[PDB]
C-alpha cells in the first residue's frame, strides 16, 4: 500500500482535481468490476468535490454506483448540518441513481427514533452484508480531516478511534457540534481499496505530516485511515507545508 501525495495550489484547484479524480475512479471501477462503491464525507472540500462530479455526471452509469457515508450527524433529517442532505443538493439529487443504491445513515427523527446506539448498529448490519458479499469492500472512502487529525467522527483518545471490532459506532459526545454522530470505525475505513483524504489549509499541515509519517491513530486518527491498495492525500500547498 503506497501513499500518494498530489498537491494543488489552492482549495479551488484541489476540489476540482479531487472531483475529476473521483469521476475517473468510478469509471475505472465500473470498467474492472461492473460497479463502483464509494463512501462520501462531509465538510467543505468533501461536498465541494461532489459539485465537480455533478458537472461530469453524464460520463457515468449511476445504476452501477453504490453510495455510503463515513459519518453523519445524528440530528433531524432536514437539518442543514446533515452530511447526506449536503451531498444530495451537491450531486445525488441531480443524477439517475436508484435510491436502493444510496445508503444514508439514520437521522434522529428517522427509522430508529432518537436511539443512537440502534441507529449505528443498523448501519453496521448493512455494512456486514456488503463485506461478506460477492464483491466486498469500498472502492474509495473519501475523507476530510481536522487540524487535530480527526476523520469521520473519530476523534483523538476516544473509544470510537480505539474500536477494533465494530464497523460502526455511535458518538454521543463529539467535541465539535453537534455532539451526536454515527461513524465508521478504522476497521471499516481500512476495508477500502483506496482512502482519499482531501485536505486544504495551513491549520491542517501538522496533522497531514504526522499522519503521512505514521503516528499512533489514537493520537492522530487520520494515521489509521489507510487503503488496502493506496492512501491518497489530495492536499493544497498550505496543507502540505510540513512534509
Write down how long the chain is. 243
Q: Is there a binding annotation on residue 216? A: no
Q: Is there a binding annotation on residue 114? A: no
Kindly state the helix (H) or strand (E) to which residue 194 belongs, with its residue range.
Answer: strand 192-199
Contacts of 216 (CB under 8 A, 6+ apart): 223
In Å, how far from its chain's centre is CA 97? 19
Closest CA to 89 of 80, 99, 98: 80
Q: Is there a binding annotation on residue 219? A: no
Judge whether 161 and 71 are in contact, CB under 8 Å.
no
Judge whether 102 and 96 are in contact, CB under 8 Å.
no
Q: How was this structure determined?
A: X-ray
Sheet holding 181-184, edge to edge: 71-73, 181-184, 168-171
Q: Is there a binding annotation on residue 141? A: no
**Rounded Cα distance, 42 and 95, in Å:** 19
Which residue range is the domain that position 88 belongs to?
1-243
CA distance readout (Å), 76 to 34, 54, 62, 73, 106: 35, 26, 27, 9, 9
Structural domains in the chain (count): 1
Per the structure block, which three cell numbers stand in for 63? 445504476
Give pairs for 164-171: CB < 8 Å, separation 24+. 166/120, 166/124, 167/124, 167/127, 167/128, 167/131, 168/120, 168/121, 168/123, 168/124, 168/127, 169/120, 170/74, 170/116, 170/117, 170/119, 170/120
Q: Is there a binding annotation on residue 237? A: yes
Give the residue ranges of DSSP H helices in the chain.
11-33, 44-55, 83-90, 116-131, 159-162, 186-189, 205-213
**Rounded Cα distance, 120 and 189, in Å:** 15
For residue 153, what is the domain's CATH number? 3.40.50.1360
Q: Is there a binding annotation on residue 94? A: yes
Closest CA to 43 of 25, 70, 22, 21: 70
Amino acid at each position: 500500500s503506497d501513499t500518494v501525495i498530489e498537491r494543488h495550489a489552492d482549495t479551488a484547484a484541489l476540489v476540482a482535481a479531487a472531483g475529476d479524480r473521483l469521476v475517473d475512479a468510478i469509471s475505472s471501477a465500473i470498467g474492472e468490476r461492473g460497479q463502483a462503491t464509494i463512501v462520501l464525507t462531509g465538510g467543505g472540500t468533501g461536498i465541494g468535490l461532489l459539485k465537480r462530479v455533478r458537472e461530469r455526471s453524464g460520463e457515468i452509469d449511476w445504476s452501477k454506483v453504490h453510495i455510503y457515508w463515513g459519518d453523519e450527524r445524528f440530528v433531524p433529517q432536514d437539518d442543514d448540518e446533515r452530511n447526506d442532505k449536503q451531498a444530495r443538493e451537491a450531486l445525488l439529487d441531480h443524477i439517475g441513481i436508484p435510491p436502493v443504491n444510496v445508503h444514508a445513515m439514520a437521522a434522529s427523527d428517522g427509522e430508529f427514533g432518537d436511539d443512537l446506539e440502534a441507529a449505528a448498529a443498523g448501519y453496521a448490519q448493512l455494512l456486514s452484508a456488503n463485506f461478506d458479499s460477492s464483491v466486498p469492500g469500498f472502492d474509495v472512502h473519501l475523507l476530510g480531516m481536522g487540524g487535530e487529525g480527526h476523520v469521520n467522527s473519530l476523534f483523538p483518545d476516544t473509544d470510537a478511534v480505539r474500536e477494533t471490532e465494530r464497523l460502526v459506532v455511535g458518538v454521543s459526545d463529539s467535541p465539535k457540534p453537534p455532539p451526536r454522530r454515527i461513524t465508521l470505525t478504522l476497521p471499516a475505513v481500512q476495508n477500502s481499496r483506496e482512502v482519499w483524504l482531501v485536505v486544504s489549509g495551513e491549520a491542517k499541515a501538522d496533522a497531514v505530516a504526522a499522519a503521512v509519517g505514521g503516528a499512533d491513530p489514537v493520537d492522530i486518527p487520520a494515521a489509521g485511515a489507510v487503503g488496502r491498495e493506496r492512501t491518497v492525500w489530495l492536499v493544497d500547498e498550505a496543507a502540505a507545508a510540513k512534509l
